[PDB]
């Protein structure tokens, strides 16, 4: 139960809503259902309209805004009284007039970019506001007192599909991969939960005619974020070193465990985070489902993850050594909360 | 008796094998083609100048118009991957309208990004260039504002010294071609490429152009196979 009421100022126009964590599993989303309570003792505007906005920030380059008129019955729609609303009408009394926002797939998950120190006054990212107002006209400026917002979030959880085992292999490169020299790095699964370590196994052969130095396992965050046109970002999440022991004709088969955690990437600028209601200490950003794997078209924030395996050669002379002599592979994965 | 039956069956096997080796010999020398479009996009004179067998420079080609193209194009895409090219017609005078140019771009992206078509190179053909010139000469419609992406792609530095042109027309043509070029370079497979080309109602030259582009496709596939590229 425990409906979340806001009690808009001047003692008027209280609004009630259910869960504030609306879920988008893969596609489709719970409608934003609830009841707004408006006492009809003034009727100065004779029109109360509640809106939902997907505004983007750091102002307010909005994404999708919808409006609902509710003081009149609005006979065009016949949305059934929800399971919460059936009792909410009885609880609130006579003046309980319902509202519902059925949102199609329009905007991505509410992911807030990490503010910088001395560079934070408000939230910066994607969020929903759900404003409510009582105005006779359509777009007059209400503000003042009888205007109420309620930050709600859309989040995605782990699907019931572990997925295949990510694999990759590189074989040759400039004046570095020459005699047989291949990497057979793989992964365990595709779905991981936050705070749980991820393990990677290596199968380098080093049949080459030149030695190779220590590897460097790292985790990348491919945060495809932009509003005006498009852009792309890539910032580190976690990394680990290794040992300088690989000799020619030696198949190293070490395994490494990396735990992506937020205790260290506190000062990283541009590191995406999960939705913050009010400047709270949240977790790392969860990877989103990229347009149900069928469209690959976006209009907001995309967060994706991929590990990297780098190998050093430590070239030793003038025989065409000083060039691009690094071999690397990338393995994607989806890091999500479970439910 | 049973040995006689087996001998007769073997003779039949040999006869069909020979009659099928002949078919293989004639089939390997013929390269398939996909003639595409967007309905009234302008695949009208190209299909004649749904089998369209024609041989140019002693090598035979045949394009297969899809027919109707109701919906769910990927249903019949799965068969047209043994072809060598996809002659995909584009309307280039439908900038104003629906936004048929935008729909053509979307369907081109769909054709490009199919997994079963992620090897087959598509050849473009921006038709109604004469109609495009007629539309842009008066410019009652905004040149490209209906496609508001035109805000910085003014001079791609690609010279177009063609006589009897107009600078606005050339800028619009460059934008329209780049509209598909961006989608082409978005996927760097390295096996399938793009061949944006200009056409007209009176072309009288694509019989050579499709041949040259098919030759380039074959050479590029062979070069990719041999690691020379």
């Amino acid at each position: 139960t425990r409906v979340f009421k806001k009690a808009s100022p001047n003692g008027k126009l209280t609004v009630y809503l259910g869960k504030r964590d609306f879920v988008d599993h893969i596609d489709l989303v719970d409608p934003v259902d609830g009841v707004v309570l408006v006492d009809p003792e003034y009727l100065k505007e004779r029109r109360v309209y509640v809106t939902l906005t997907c505004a983007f920030r750091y102002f307010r380059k909005d994404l999708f805004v919808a409006n609902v008129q509710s003081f009149p019955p609005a006979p065009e729609d016949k949305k059934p009284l929800t399971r919460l609303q059936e009792r909410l009408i009885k609880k609130l009394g006579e003046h309980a007039y319902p509202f519902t926002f059925e949102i199609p797939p329009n905007l991505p998950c509410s992911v807030t970019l990490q503010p910088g120190p001395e560079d934070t006054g408000k939230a910066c990212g994607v969020d929903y506001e759900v404003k409510a107002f009582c105005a006779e006209n359509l777009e007059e400026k209400i503000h003042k007192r009888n205007s109420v917002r309620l930050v709600i979030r859309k989040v995605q959880y782990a699907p019931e599909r572990p997925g295949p085992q990510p694999t990759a292999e590189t074989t040759r490169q400039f004046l570095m991969s020459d005699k047989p020299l291949h990497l057979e790095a793989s992964l365990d699964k595709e779905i991981y939960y936050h705070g749980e370590p991820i393990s990677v196994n290596v199968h380098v052969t080093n049949n080459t005619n030149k030695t190779v130095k220590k590897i460097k396992i790292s985790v990348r965050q491919y945060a495809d974020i932009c509003l005006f046109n498009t852009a792309q970002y890539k910032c580190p999440v976690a990394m680990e070193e290794a040992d300088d022991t690989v000799a020619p004709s030696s198949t190293f088969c070490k395994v490494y465990t990396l735990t992506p955690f937020l205790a260290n990437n506190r000062e990283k600028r541009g590191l995406a985070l999960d939705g913050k209601l009010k400047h709270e200490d949240t977790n790392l950003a969860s990877s989103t489902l990229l347009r149900e794997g069928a469209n690959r078209e976006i209009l907001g924030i995309i967060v994706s993850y991929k590990v990297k395996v780098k190998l050093v050669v430590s070239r030793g002379g003038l025989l065409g050594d000083l060039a691009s002599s690094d071999v690397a592979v990338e393995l994607p994965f989806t890091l999500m909360h479970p439910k | 008796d049973q040995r006689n039956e087996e001998k007769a069956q073997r003779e039949a096997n040999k006869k069909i094998e020979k009659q099928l080796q002949k078919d293989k010999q004639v089939y390997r020398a013929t390269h398939r083609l996909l003639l595409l479009g967007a309905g009234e996009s302008g695949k009208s004179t190209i299909v004649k100048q749904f089998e369209t067998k024609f041989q140019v420079d002693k090598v035979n080609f045949h394009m297969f118009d899809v027919g109707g193209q109701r919906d769910e194009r990927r249903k019949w895409i799965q068969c047209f991957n043994d072809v060598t090219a996809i002659i995909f017609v584009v309307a280039s005078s439908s900038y104003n309208m629906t936004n048929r140019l935008q729909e053509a771009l979307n369907l081109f992206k769909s054709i490009w990004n199919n997994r079963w078509l992620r090897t087959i190179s598509v050849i473009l053909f921006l038709n109604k260039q004469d109609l495009l010139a007629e539309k842009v000469l008066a410019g009652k419609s905004k040149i490209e504002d209906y496609f508001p992406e035109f805000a910085r792609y003014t001079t791609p530095e690609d010279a177009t010294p063609e006589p009897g042109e107009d600078p606005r027309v050339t800028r619009a043509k460059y934008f329209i071609r780049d509209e598909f070029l961006r989608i082409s370079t978005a996927s760097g497979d390295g096996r399938h490429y793009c061949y944006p080309h200009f056409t007209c109602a009176v072309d009288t030259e694509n019989i050579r152009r499709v041949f040259n582009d098919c030759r380039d496709i074959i050479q590029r596939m062979h070069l990719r196979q041999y690691e020379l590229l």
Binding site: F174 | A29, D57, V59, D216, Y226, E227
Partner: protein, 281 residues
């Protein structure tokens, strides 16, 4: 001393390497049906040519070097020399054939598929192999290749390659220099075509680099392996007292390594490599 034992291990390593590489590529070809291709026929012929030598030439030559007293006999000396010449000539000529096949696949793209079919490929391979046979086993086994060695050939211990000038020149130009010229022209043409294609790509979708890094492996490993040997042959045949037997043998052996390298040169493609990895277990 240590020189003999040091050579005894490296010769064994090189013979096992070449044999294993060639047999691995032959089994990779034989296993998967998808590995049967018109150019894969030439690759298989080259693998067989470079493989037969691995078991029937390299061990016997290593035995001769380790103990320079050919006890196998005066007839098996001749037979071993014959198969030596046959295997190396077949390897070089099959390199030339694969090169000219890749040249036809670029200069004549619309004609390649119906010009080089299975029957034509088999005829070409048989014709190359029979040419190699006609200059390796007819002369050596019928003694058209021959003063200082008159006593040696009569002496049933020494198997020293004393070829007369006529056979030396004929075998050199037949086996190496003519295929070298053909392959040079072929790869000049394909390099020009690759440059033109790169220029077209740069002109159209632009918003030496790659041809060199493959042309070098394909046209320079074979050169650095064989060309010094096949020029020292002319040097030691035209005028004596120029090169010595030991240096002659060293150049021969550094030429022997291309037949073990060439599975890696001509089979580092993902389509065959998938099958190769499938053979791991």
């Amino acid at each position: 001393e240590v020189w003999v034992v040091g050579m005894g291990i490296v010769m064994s390593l090189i013979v096992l390497a070449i044999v294993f590489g060639n047999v691995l590529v032959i089994t990779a070809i034989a296993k998967f049906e998808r590995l049967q291709t018109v150019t894969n026929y030439f690759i298989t012929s080259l693998a067989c040519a470079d493989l037969v030598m691995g078991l029937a030439v390299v061990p016997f030559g290593a035995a001769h070097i380790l103990m320079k007293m050919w006890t196998f006999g005066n007839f098996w000396c001749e037979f071993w020399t014959s198969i030596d010449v046959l295997c190396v000539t077949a390897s070089i000529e099959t390199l030339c054939v694969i090169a000219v096949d890749r040249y036809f696949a670029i200069t004549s793209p619309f004609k390649y598929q119906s010009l080089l079919t299975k029957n034509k490929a088999r005829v070409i391979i048989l014709m190359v192999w029979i040419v190699s046979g006609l200059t390796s086993f007819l002369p050596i086994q019928m003694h058209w290749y021959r003063q200082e060695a008159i006593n040696c050939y009569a002496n049933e211990t020494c198997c020293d390659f004393f070829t007369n000038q006529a056979y030396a020149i004929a075998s050199s130009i037949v086996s190496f220099y003519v295929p070298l010229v053909i392959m040079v022209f072929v790869y000049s043409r394909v390099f020009q075509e690759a440059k033109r294609q790169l220029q077209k790509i740069d002109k159209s979708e632009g918003r030496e680099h790659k041809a060199l890094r493959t042309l070098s492996v394909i046209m320079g490993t074979f050169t650095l392996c064989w060309l010094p040997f096949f020029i020292v042959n002319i040097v030691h045949v035209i005028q004596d007292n120029l090169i010595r037997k030991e240096v002659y043998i060293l150049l021969n052996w550094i030429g022997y390594v291309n037949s073990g390298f060439n599975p890696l040169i001509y089979c580092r493609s993902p389509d065959f490599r998938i099958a190769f990895q499938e053979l791991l277990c």
